[PDB]
Design a protein around this ligand. Structure first.
Ligand SMILES: Nc1nc2c(ncn2[C@H]2C[C@H](O)[C@@H](COP(=O)(O)OP(=O)(O)OP(=O)(O)O)O2)c(=O)[nH]1
Ligand SMILES: Nc1nc2c(ncn2[C@H]2C[C@H](O)[C@@H](COP(=O)(O)OP(=O)(O)OP(=O)(O)O)O2)c(=O)[nH]1
Ligand SMILES: Cc1cn([C@H]2C[C@H](O)[C@@H](COP(=O)(O)OP(=O)(O)OP(=O)(O)O)O2)c(=O)[nH]c1=O
Ligand SMILES: Cc1cn([C@H]2C[C@H](O)[C@@H](COP(=O)(O)OP(=O)(O)OP(=O)(O)O)O2)c(=O)[nH]c1=O
Ligand SMILES: Cc1cn([C@H]2C[C@H](O)[C@@H](COP(=O)(O)OP(=O)(O)OP(=O)(O)O)O2)c(=O)[nH]c1=O
Ligand SMILES: [Mg+2]
Ligand SMILES: [Mg+2]
Ligand SMILES: [Mg+2]
Lengths: 461, 461, 235
């Protein structure tokens, strides 16, 4: 029974330019002009430290997700407006707010992801599992599960709300609609839930999220309706474009993907998959007549595969959203994802399985991921020498290497760490380390690791 | 004989899905999903091969320009519609077409820029000056001036029209409005126009551009009105953002920029410059109270200077466009640029001068540009061994190194090179070399140069 | 010799495709699609039988929990068996049918494969190897490197070989004498034999015999060592 008036709340958290621009539009400008958005250009999606420049990075993936979300917003505002946007106040300009909101929401997702992709985050978690023992009295509290089960969504929210500090504790000061629709999992690490398997915000954001809920009609475990659209766009985008990158790299062929989709027990009779396969086969028959090398033929065929699969999946997602709009607006929505409720469920699942089999588990990818895990763990080990004990009071950081390595951390991150709040000291220093590591690009991480290892030779005997 | 918005917003395509998406909107998707768009992430804007991940690259520059153009289009369509768009048929929806058209035009504006920035292009030109001598009868014709004065816009047009070939001769098959608006300088190298100092297309596109004009009501010399918007957005988004990058790199300080603007002869009494300086000083006074390092203070002061300057310049550009819309719609418009006819001319010119003084002409920048020039010239010398004589008939390319080098060139560019047309053979060879080199990223160019130099050790004797 | 040529063609056409699949340059389904989409193998009975048997075995193989690389490897392991058996049987049948023509004093048969029922499958496999195995980035780069190595080594050896038989004493430089001493003694012994061959022909034959007999690693090592030893005379 949620109302679109509060779901599209244009107010901002900071207590009270902008010439001919809605506040939601200004949120997109704030997100785009932020340093983490630019740093996304050197964060891995699937293949780390890739030499090929046509393979998706985190920034290109984010922009493509934003474009897909903006297209869905265009299809929802200029069309089907009377079907999903019922009982909306006249002051709200849907045609300008909804597409901008979806585009900004898609762009801002994966902003806080750690370097080296998902396997990077695991590495961080593993470090936080060893250096923050659960049996230890200091870290026995379950709030430290924010670090032992580290994920990029909570870091994205922290970055957009606290880390991007200029002179206030409100970060980028995004609108309530963007902050509400940015939370992919409305639950904390301490809270237990079966609907969501991942925490969506840190303990430090627990009040902030509450504020957002109080200003949007949401609550714990209830997602903003546009969060489902953003998640569906994210899934579609990475599932298709990772397959494109795999085939372009040469790890697989276009016929390999076609045979995988055809032989999948779920896509064998799926109408969307059948239509996509038929169109791709029809275009590939025409393409094969040209005098092309096999690699060029594969890339040409999979560009049309991109077009057809993206169009079909986006249409299915829009239809599913329009059909289940009442369910999404319910105060007790239980939908896991928009893709599962659409007809493109089987095709997306098959694409994800193909990306896992021929992608993530490739030999070069695995070796690069092990190297990145070693780099990340070494960097966190060296940073902990300068971070640990700074907030509790123990002066183990007073060594020259500790002081220098504390000086190498982000200044705004240290300002947030040096703030006076109710967070426990160990949580504060662990959060500082998590922010520092997750804010780094791959190349910056390698360079800093090498430099600090060179500078650590004396204190490491 | 003023042009009409019906012809200027022509959504037809050159070639003789689409579920709820306008054609101009689909042009943005075609541009964004194109490989060169994401290859722009590794092409220099000002600082070549910069280790700082926050310094703007060509992709971030293009995205910022696209966002600014989309904002201006939103202002033009949603707000200033009755005074800017007149006698517009109901078939074209301005609210969806104009913002999308401007966003696509801004995103595509620097797709074909050569590696290592403008200086890199200069390097290419220098090589084409030596290896295609004017006194030689083979290259005596003025058409080869397309290569002696190589520019990124000419390469971008042929990239979006011919180089992105799958099975057509129409490239990405963009709409006529998108193709017309992307032509920054509507003149060829052979043509002698005093209005435009640079050619905007090669001889190979001489027919194609003509077609665009025939379908848009334009002509040689006259420029699409939205191209002025794109040029103004590009100028603003590089003038401000390059200054921000200069401050971030440590080459200058916030007070340095403030003093440069205040001491500027034209910005001394400029109202826009005075307003920007006053607002920045007011914010910086509050910012200086907090315990901050000088670098962080400069960074977060420039973070507000960027917001204020971008807002003021965008508003001034929109006002200038609205005031002079009749002149821009004239068949014989003579306006050089939108910035110069606006109230933000002085501030933008001063920012460009500041970037020239502090950003370029810097020791590290100059050294890196010389290294990039050497790299580009060596790579082009190596590729000319495998390219020269391929079309004329001279079998000097038949050495094993020449065959391998030809095989290392992009298959799309080779496919376009081997097409049957009326272009001169020497022109085709030089165009193949220019297309191969201009599309490379910096890292790819360095890697290919090193690998081919290692492989050339025998034939170089 | 026709039997040998047919066996050579079969044993490289099938085994090079297997090597292509093993290296990861292509997949088993890629080869199956290439054979099925081939113009001549579209209706070839031997190709149809091989494809059907391979598909039947691969359907059973795909049930087990396997990585894609292992599935491709063990599917091509059965494709090799089926294709080799069919091609060998076809070659034997063709030889038996045309034995009288092969025993003719003026036989004109180009090859045993082309006159057999396995011509289309072998030709398609050769085309697949050309498309995917050769003309590959790594293969082309390695071949260019090998060409440079071979040409440099032959240039270095020509300094010690040229003029040895004609009479021109341009080989008498210390590098030339050492290079000649580094050539195989069997090939030098054949080169120094007295016969009616032209002196230039003998010198070129000595160089060709010396170079063609080298392995790849030996060629690289000798090229590097002689290039290091040639730094003075190369000035
Ligand atoms: N190299 C490598 N890449 C992976 C792996 N797993 C996933 N990826 C890729 C696929 C995606 O583009 C991205 C993972 O997607 P996300 O982490 O953003 O999913 P998230 O849990 O945030 O929410 P979602 O599943 O989209 O609902 O990295 C892996 O195990 N190894
Ligand atoms: N390192 C370096 N960067 C330069 C130089 N000249 C310009 N840049 C920067 C400024 C711009 O962001 C960009 C050049 O853009 P352009 O002005 O050349 O674009 P275009 O001529 O096509 O149109 P426009 O002049 O902007 O109206 O690189 C230079 O000489 N050295
Ligand atoms: C300067 C820089 C920082 N980083 C990482 C390191 C930190 O984890 C994170 C923040 O460090 P910062 O040095 O504070 O980055 P910034 O000041 O340029 O921009 P902002 O503070 O608004 O984010 O950015 C990189 O990955 N590459 C770089 O070049
Ligand atoms: C693959 C690749 C190409 N390039 C350059 C080199 C060429 O000049 C240009 C085209 O070479 P291609 O390799 O043909 O690029 P692509 O086919 O993958 O994508 P598209 O043709 O749609 O652009 O791209 C890079 O800079 N880095 C790379 O990784
Ligand atoms: C010894 C040796 C020779 N070769 C090449 C170099 C010569 O071209 C060719 C003959 O050189 P030889 O050294 O004379 O070979 P061999 O005498 O041991 O055996 P045989 O004469 O019966 O063949 O063999 C290698 O490739 N690797 C080696 O280790
Ligand atoms: Mg994502
Ligand atoms: Mg530009
Ligand atoms: Mg053989």
């Amino acid at each position: 029974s949620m109302h679109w008036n509060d779901l599209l709340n244009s107010n901002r958290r900071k207590p009270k330019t902008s010439k001919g621009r809605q506040q939601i539009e200004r949120d997109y400008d704030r997100i785009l002009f932020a340093a983490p958005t630019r740093r996304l250009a050197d964060k891995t999606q699937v293949f780390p430290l890739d030499k090929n420049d046509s393979v998706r990075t985190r920034l290109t993936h984010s922009h493509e997700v934003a474009n897909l979300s903006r297209g869905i917003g265009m299809r929802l505002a200029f069309e089907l407006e009377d079907d999903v946007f019922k009982d909306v106040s006249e002051d709200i300009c849907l045609k300008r707010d909804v597409p901008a909101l979806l585009a900004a929401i898609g762009l801002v997702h994966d902003m806080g992801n750690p370097p080296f992709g998902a396997q990077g985050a695991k590495a961080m978690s593993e470090w936080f599992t060893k250096n923050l023992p659960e049996h230890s009295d200091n870290y026995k509290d379950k709030i430290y599960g924010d670090f032992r089960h580290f994920d990029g969504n909570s870091q994205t929210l922290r970055l957009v709300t606290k880390l991007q500090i200029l002179n206030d504790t409100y970060g980028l000061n995004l609108t309530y609609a963007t902050l509400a629709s940015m939370i992919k999992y409305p639950r904390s690490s301490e809270s237990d839930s079966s609907l969501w398997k991942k925490h969506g915000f840190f303990l430090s954001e627990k009040d902030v999220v509450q504020d957002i809920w109080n200003n949007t009609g949401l609550s714990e475990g209830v997602r903003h309706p546009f969060t489902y659209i953003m998640e569906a766009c994210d899934d579609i985008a990475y599932s298709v474009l990772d397959a494109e990158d795999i085939i372009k790299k040469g790890f697989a062929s276009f016929h390999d993907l076609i045979d995988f989709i055809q032989s999948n027990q779920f896509c064998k009779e799926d109408d969307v998959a059948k239509r996509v396969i038929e169109n791709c086969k029809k275009i590939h028959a025409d393409y094969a007549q040209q005098k092309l090398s096999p690699a060029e033929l594969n890339d040409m065929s999979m560009q049309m595969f991109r077009v057809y699969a993206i169009a079909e999946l986006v249409d299915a997602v829009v239809i599913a959203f329009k059909d289940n709009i009442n369910e999404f607006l319910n105060d007790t929505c239980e939908i896991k994802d928009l893709i599962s409720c659409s007809s493109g469920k089987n095709l997306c699942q098959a694409l994800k399985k193909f990306d896992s089999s021929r992608g993530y588990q490739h030999r070069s990818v695995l070796k690069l991921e092990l190297e990145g895990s070693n780099y990340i763990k070494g960097l966190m080990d060296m940073l902990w020498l300068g971070i640990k004990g700074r907030a509790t009071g123990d002066t183990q950081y007073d060594t020259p290497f500790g002081r220098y390595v504390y000086g190498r951390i982000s200044e705004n991150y240290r300002r947030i760490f040096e703030q006076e709040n109710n967070l426990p000291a160990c949580y504060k220093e662990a959060q500082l380390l998590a922010d520092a590591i997750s804010g780094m690009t791959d190349s910056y991480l390698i360079a800093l690791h090498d430099e600090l290892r060179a500078l650590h030779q004396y204190e490491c005997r």
